[PDB]
Each structure stands twice: as C-alpha cells, then as structure tokens.
C-alpha cells in the first residue's frame, strides 16, 4: 500500500466537471510565440508611422503558481496526477487546503500543457477572470468543491 | 551578531506543513507511543540513544509533545 499522502491523487473530477473546467480554461489560452510576435510587429508598425486593459491568462508555472498560492491571489488551481517527481506536487494539495484556495486534481499533465501551449504543465491556476466569466468561475469553484472536498472527504485517509 | 536572523514565520509555516504532510518516522512513532504510555522519563532515553545528544533528544521530545497536543486536542 501507500501512505495517506500518496493515493490522494487519482481521485480526479468526474467527466462532466473536468470537461466544464477545461472548456472554461480554453477561453484564456495564453498567446503563443507566433501570436505575441505578430501582435508586437503590428504595434511596432503602428508606432513606426504613428491603453489596452490588463491581459487575462492562466497562470501555470509551478514556481509561479506556488508563489500565487500562500498569498490568496489564486482562485482555482489544477494539479496534474502524473508528475514523475511526485515530491514536487505532494505538498500542493495540503498547502492549498491550509490557505483555503480551491484546488482540483486533473488527469494527465499533458492535458494541462495543451491548454497552455506547453508539452507538459505541472499545474494550471487562475488568478483574475473577466466579469463575464466571474459567475461561471464561482459556479465552477462551487461544483469542484462539492465534488472533491465532500465526495472525496476521505481522500486524505485510509492509506 | 549581524546575520543571525529570525524565522519570519514563513519557515515556521513551511516546516509545519512539511511535518503534517510527511507524517512520522518509525522512531518518531515509537517515541510518541512511549510518551503517550510511558512518559518523558522513558522517551528521552530512547531519543538520546537514537540521536546521541541530550539537547537534541530533549528538543525532539518537546516537538513530539507539541505535535501530540496539537493533534489530540482538536
């Protein structure tokens, strides 16, 4: 068997909840290299011949996400269940629970990487969202909480 | 002293989280079992034997007692 901290993963969200979460995340795909490059070239061309709001994107860096957590700025955190150095992610669920930041465990790091234009993303978290999706973000947070903390309240028990 | 520094409570928080998540080592488990059944007079000898330093054994016993108090009293 495995200690209680191990096997906490693999108790991922159901099909519908995971699909809804990925659908919501797909609306905030960070601009790829080509998109950013073309935008910068267009801006340069406009400047050559002669005020945008804060951009919205999903924060995914492991160090960046961990920094976002413990400051209560992050609202939703997605955790990969197939991280080869498990020690890099063993502490994330407990840290999120202590900080109160909602969190979920999703199947596959490649799935997280796909929504962030990366081969493999260890974690994916959201800090700020548009007012249109604020209600959707709250609904997803509530659904994730109900389906993870209550449904899998024993995830931290029974080795 | 010019660089002794203090915890800042960030090291405290991280260490507490690590202690909670990691669990208890088999020798730590035996120490807490002895404390909850025998007491300090019997636990400190085992702690010193495992560690070899009386001060380290006393510190470990105090940490185990604090952990037990935080656990059983909640």
């Amino acid at each position: 068997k495995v200690p209680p901290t191990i096997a906490q993963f693999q108790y991922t969200l159901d099909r519908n909840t995971a699909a809804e979460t990925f659908k919501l995340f797909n609306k905030y795909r960070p601009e790829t290299a080509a998109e950013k490059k073309e935008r910068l070239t267009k801006e340069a061309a406009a400047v050559a011949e002669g005020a945008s709001p804060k951009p919205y994107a999903v924060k995914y860096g492991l160090n960046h996400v961990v920094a976002l957590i413990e400051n209560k700025k992050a609202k939703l955190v997605l955790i990969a269940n197939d991280v080869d150095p498990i020690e890099l992610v063993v502490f994330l669920p407990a840290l999120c629970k202590k900080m109160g930041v909602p969190y979920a465990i999703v199947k596959g790091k490649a799935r997280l990487g796909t929504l962030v234009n990366q081969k493999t993303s260890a974690v994916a978290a959201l800090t700020e969202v548009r007012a249109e999706d604020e209600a959707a973000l709250a609904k997803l947070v509530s659904t994730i909480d109900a389906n993870f903390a209550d449904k899998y309240d024993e995830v931290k028990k029974h080795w | 002293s010019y660089k002794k520094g203090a915890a800042s409570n960030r090291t405290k928080f991280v260490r507490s989280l690590v202690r909670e998540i990691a669990g208890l080592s088999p020798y730590e488990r035996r120490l807490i079992d002895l404390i909850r059944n025998s007491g300090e007079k019997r636990a400190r000898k085992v702690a010193k034997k495992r560690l070899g330093s009386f001060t380290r054994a006393k510190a470990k016993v105090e940490e185990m007692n604090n952990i037990i108090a935080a656990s059983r009293r909640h």
Partner: peptide, 15 residues
C-alpha cells in the same frame, strides 16, 4: 502502523 492523516495544522485556514 497504517493510520489516517490528521489535519492539526490544516484544520484552520490561513486568513
């Protein structure tokens, strides 16, 4: 030997 984890530290959220 095999016992459930305890939330002594995680019981109270960090305000």
């Amino acid at each position: 030997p095999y016992e459930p984890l305890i939330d002594w530290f995680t019981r109270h959220e960090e305000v």
